[PDB]
From a paper:
To ascertain if this is a conserved mechanism among FBI-GS-[name] complexes and to elucidate, in detail, the molecular mechanism by which low G + C Gram-positive FBI-GS proteins bind [name], we utilized single-particle cryo-electron microscopy (cryo-EM) and solved high-resolution structures of the Bs (1.96 Å), Lm (2.61 Å), Pp (2.07-2.28 Å), and Sa (2.15 Å) FBI-GS-[name] C-tail complexes. Notably, the Bs and Lm GS proteins in the complexes were all tetradecameric, while the Pp GS in the complex formed 10% tetradecamers and 90% dodecamers and the GS in the Sa FBI-GS-[name] structure was all dodecameric. Despite the differences in the GS oligomeric states among these complexes, the GS subunits in each adopted essentially the same conformation (superimpositions result in root mean square deviations (rmsds) of 0.5–0.7 Å for alignment of 400 corresponding Cα atoms). Peptide density was evident for 8-10 residues of the [name] C-tails from Pp (IQGELSRF), Sa (PINRGDLSRF), and Bs (FRQGDMSRF), and 5 [name] C-terminal residues (QLPRF), in the Lm complex. These [name] C-tails all form a distorted helix and bind within the GS active sites. In the FBI-GS-[name] structures, each GS pore binds two closely juxtaposed but non-interacting [name] C-tails as each pore contains two active sites, one from each ring. [name] contacts are also provided by GS residues on thong helix α14´ from the adjacent dimer and α15″ from the neighboring subunit of the other ring. Thus, the [name] binding site within the GS active site is positioned at the nexus of the double-ring oligomerization region. B Density for [name] peptide and contacts with GS in the Pp FBI-GS(12)-[name] complex (map contoured at 0.09 σ). Residues making contacts are labeled and different GS subunits are denoted as GSI, GSII, and GSIII, underscoring that three GS subunits participate in [name] contacts.
In Gram-positive bacteria, nitrogen homeostasis is controlled by an operon encoding [name] (GS), a dodecameric machine that assimilates ammonium into glutamine, and the [name] repressor. [name] detects nitrogen excess indirectly by binding glutamine-feedback-inhibited-GS (FBI-GS), which activates its transcription-repression function. GS generates glutamine from glutamate, ATP, and ammonium by a mechanism that involves the initial phosphorylation of the γ-carboxyl group of glutamate by ATP and the subsequent incorporation of ammonium. The structures show FBI-GS binds the [name] C-terminal domain within its active-site cavity, juxtaposing two [name] monomers to form a DNA-binding-competent [name] dimer.
Numbering used by the authors:
A (entry chain Q), B (entry chain B), C (entry chain W): 2 to 442
D (entry chain A), E (entry chain I), F (entry chain M), G (entry chain U), H (entry chain D): 2 to 11
Write the structure that this text describes.
Amino acid sequence: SYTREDIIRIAEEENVRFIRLQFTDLLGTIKNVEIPVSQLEKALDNKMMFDGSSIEGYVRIEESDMYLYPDLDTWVVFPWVTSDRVARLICDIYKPDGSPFAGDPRGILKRVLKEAEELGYTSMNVGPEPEFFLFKTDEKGDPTTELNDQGGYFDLAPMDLGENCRREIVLKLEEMGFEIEASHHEVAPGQHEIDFKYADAVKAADQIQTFKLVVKTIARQHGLHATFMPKPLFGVNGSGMHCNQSLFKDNENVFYDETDELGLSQTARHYMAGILKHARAMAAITNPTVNSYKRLVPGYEAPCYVAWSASNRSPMIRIPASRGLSTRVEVRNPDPAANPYLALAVMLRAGLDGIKRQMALPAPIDRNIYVMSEEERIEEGIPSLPADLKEALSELIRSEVISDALGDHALAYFYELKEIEWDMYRTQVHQWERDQYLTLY
Amino acid sequence: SYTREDIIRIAEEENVRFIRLQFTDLLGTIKNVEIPVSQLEKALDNKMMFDGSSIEGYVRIEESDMYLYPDLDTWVVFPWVTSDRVARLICDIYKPDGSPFAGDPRGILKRVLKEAEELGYTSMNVGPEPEFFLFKTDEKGDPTTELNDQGGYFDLAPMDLGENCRREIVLKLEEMGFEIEASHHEVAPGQHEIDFKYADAVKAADQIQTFKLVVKTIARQHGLHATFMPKPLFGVNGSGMHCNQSLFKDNENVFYDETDELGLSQTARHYMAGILKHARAMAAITNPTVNSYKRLVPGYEAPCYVAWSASNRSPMIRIPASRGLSTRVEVRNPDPAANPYLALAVMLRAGLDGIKRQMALPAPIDRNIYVMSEEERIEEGIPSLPADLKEALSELIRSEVISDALGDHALAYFYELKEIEWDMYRTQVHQWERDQYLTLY
Amino acid sequence: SYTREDIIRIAEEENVRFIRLQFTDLLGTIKNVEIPVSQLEKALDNKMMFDGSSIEGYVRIEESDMYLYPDLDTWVVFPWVTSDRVARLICDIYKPDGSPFAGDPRGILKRVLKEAEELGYTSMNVGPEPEFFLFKTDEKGDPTTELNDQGGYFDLAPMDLGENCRREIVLKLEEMGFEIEASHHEVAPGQHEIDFKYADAVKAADQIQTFKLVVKTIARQHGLHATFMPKPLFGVNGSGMHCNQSLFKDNENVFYDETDELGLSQTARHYMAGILKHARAMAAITNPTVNSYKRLVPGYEAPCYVAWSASNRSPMIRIPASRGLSTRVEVRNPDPAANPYLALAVMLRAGLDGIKRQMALPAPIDRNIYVMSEEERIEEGIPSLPADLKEALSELIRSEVISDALGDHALAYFYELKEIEWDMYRTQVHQWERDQYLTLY
Amino acid sequence: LIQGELSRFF
Amino acid sequence: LIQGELSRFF
Amino acid sequence: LIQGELSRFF
Amino acid sequence: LIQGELSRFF
Amino acid sequence: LIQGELSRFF
Ligand SMILES: NC(=O)CC[C@H](N)C(=O)O
Ligand SMILES: NC(=O)CC[C@H](N)C(=O)O
Ligand SMILES: NC(=O)CC[C@H](N)C(=O)O
Ligand SMILES: [Mg+2]
Ligand SMILES: [Mg+2]
Ligand SMILES: [Mg+2]
Ligand SMILES: [Mg+2]
Ligand SMILES: [Mg+2]
Ligand SMILES: [Mg+2]
């Protein structure tokens, strides 16, 4: 923990000259206001005013005035091995009248956590698994189509010190204070995964944001480009952001049950049932981009159907073999492009709705895999995820449970942003069309 | 503050070998006379003689002789991390008979501040918001069409240390003694904004000049090109120089009124009314270049109509939500290409005229925005800013209020400069004309 | 003259296989409908239906249906020295109910000629002087910045047969049946002028259209590009379309008067007075493009002021030394980019208004030329032509005389087209702005 | 009205 | 509504 | 079913 | 007043 | 008379 005096003492001792008042918009892009150390005391008094309409993205209509309220527990100093140290503070957005901004994703996640606490659950324990690609750059600094390496699953390809981004990323994260569980080479060439240790939902989302920033910074430092795009290349594996989740009640894992055959309590089963029922509604949030649904194709371990299993090629929900206090429910739809706060909020809200409505868990899918016909698929009651962004947007609009989690203000702006994105995408004429046609016709 | 003995002591202690006797011409370009430290005592005796006709720009017709009178309070040492330190002094221009030069913009601003003080207002509190673009350079050192980054509004795009000009600029300014409020990435790619803390009008204009010089120097140092051109690229956001202003009377903000619904006193409302009435007259000063009116086009947040609001897409005058001693009137027409002294002088003179004549403030524009027709626009009494430099020049010539603020000597030379510029611009045949025509006709 | 039987006989005898049903839109671009010779009889029955909204240009909103009514007297066979001969017919546009289309420029000129005939003037004798530039082409066939030659005024630069376009153009025109008076090299390098023999106004405009088409075709045939753009290059002479005009009443030149000192009748003087009074109103028609007003700059023989003379550097109206039946009033504002039908119509309407109102002719400008100041210029009552397209559009809108000549339907569409063109032009950022700024600011 | 923000798509 | 005709400016 | 892992041959 | 004729020197 | 200063336009 930290206090105002502690922050001032550390900043004076560490010779910090630059402070980043970091926050997040609806699209998940990392936003911040730069600050010289001479304004640190003013920042700590919650007296910095900025636009605030930047949260709305490119659909902002008018300039507003909003205040930044830094969270002292998020203070950290970047270890960029240079003089004039740079520090950061993660801030919440407040209206000039003192009320919190309704469109802040962090505030949305906090409100969902509060309504979870109202049910007796003290915290939501979340451990994400972000994957990213490393691309080579040209003389002008732009990413090329060449990967940084040609390693495979769990390979030792980026060895030694030459352009070893994965080692440096883990080292710098550990120096910052990150709790890193493990990291490994991913399935596709040039793909890497770093797994964090488990923490509370707000801290987990802050860690995801900081991790993306650190990965991009260190990759650019080595003459490489890091991307979290869900499907950068056709025919290769995409990047996922599987989120392991478990509810807690005073350091007691309520998802655990020793008497259960699978070690899953009734509360856990209700949670998974609620997540499964509202899957197509949250697809627009956990898979927010157009490219997100190019990843959700069969044959690349990404989930394409709404079903749960303990062992399958690509289930919607997977139950890891770990038990005891580490029993978890792993949701595999989200990609790293998704907003961490919004994705965690919608998943938690769906689980809470399932718990409250005592939903019945559908039977798990056995070793049988999805070569079955569509008639066999809907005969067994196995739904499918939306095929594109428009279907997910329609499902989100028609959904009343997760739209309430988003809130009235944020839902309208998110819908406007995604509709504009889809409208821009759908009218483009791609090179594939010119390759197929323009000679046949 | 500083004295002659203090300046000599600091120069001897700091090993200063070069002193820049910096001043400004009518076009706003930064001018200076180099001086070895052995001439510092002669400079402090107001005995340095130079041309002085360089103030008139490229329309000077004869060589004159004028003296430089340095302002000791403007002394500063550049922190260019090199031996043989370089210092600067900002000087006023005086005729050989001892009278101040009428064509000095700093003297014009001082005279306007004096006639404001004659009304009982001790100071003009001004905080500008200069925005600029960063362009890449080629092997020969000339700017290209490529931006330094592709960030968005309030993005954290220039991270790390690689070509991080914004961080270095803030750090060097803070080392110089600048009071920087905050900085952020601007809407357009490659666009950056640094906001200063508020100060008196003369100090604010000196800070604007020093800020432009420092930004250009640091950007050049990183193999980049910094420009304050109002509209460098078509189809992207331009660069503005919004100036927050508030009149003070013995550390009392006369613009504040707790009883008012919007927290605006009658004096403040008269000030905004006076600024609105004379808008088209000062447009030639706050938007002095031909390119300045390519920014004043709809759809890029730049103001195009003379109207005020508390919340709108792009009003002429915006009233920030801050109240108390920070209540301000924000004027958004000026671009960074404008002369700071002249722009502040004309804005203050228009506000003073409104205060003296007790002008009636027109009603603010509501959430209704300008899709209305021209008949609806002039039925509601909403004027428009000049479409090009020629209209603004004609309005300035026909105006008696701000022409008196400029003065007889400066007005003629500014008009000659702008007329020559417009005449050169209007006879050019651009590539757009050759693209549209030369094949159709 | 020709008849249906004559046209069929010639087409069968000449082995004509292609017929171009040529017409004109509001912008002056040459439009046509292709027709196989098997449809010639159907075309001659005024039964061909086409869109007709193509006349309105790029501001057409809905598809209509209109009929083409060919003019048998305009029949001609192109001498392109190849088999499968190609012929053309010039057609008037008619609504399906049988009434002529109000937006056809040829119909507008015919209506103006009819209202002239109602005053007792049998014909309008018009001889134009179109000038054009010849540019070299690259390997891809696009025009370059290199001229075809470097000749001067009345030079013999393009001699022999090596790319001798001027000679070929005259020969092919004479073979077609054109009455060519003379041709010569123009002032600027690569500039050429061909003068036709005088004819009636409708025939003169048809000849202008055919001349432009033939010049472009022959120039393209020689690996060159012909343009009628008013000012393709800065610093060199532009291209004008001076139109010599004289009213006739049963082969009697009513402009002639032996008793007059200058050989000008009272009717002629009233005609010139009417043209001079309405000059700024017709400027939007005779100079319809943005580039048209880059030609109207001093020093290049183009007229910039509304005044008449018998000998001057660049008067609006020049009276040639020819007398008797060849006494003419030469109007020098129009450029070849102007619509011939519309320009002739508005000039004739202004002259008729002057004749009807018995306008007083202002005194001619003496050998004194326009180094005089603006005060001297408006003290002598010398108006100036509009500086750009916007001023001309405003003058046209405020004018009631020539707007009636245009008609209600055509005026709105022409105004919309020109407003869109000006709006596109005014927001562009040109290379000149980037050269002047982006380094100074 | 919002053209300068949609420059990402152009 | 009229976008395909204004392609001469783009 | 195994397409993303067989990318070594493509 | 004669600029367009002196273009041979420019 | 002022030609050396107007070189910025040439
Ligand atoms: N083996 C793995 O877990 C890879 C997962 C895969 N990259 C996905 O996007 O889900
Ligand atoms: N979001 C903003 O305030 C940008 C302002 C804009 N650049 C202008 O020129 O006014
Ligand atoms: N007649 C000439 O000498 C040339 C005329 C000039 N080209 C013009 O545009 O008017
Ligand atoms: Mg993985
Ligand atoms: Mg996993
Ligand atoms: Mg700004
Ligand atoms: Mg502002
Ligand atoms: Mg000629
Ligand atoms: Mg002539």
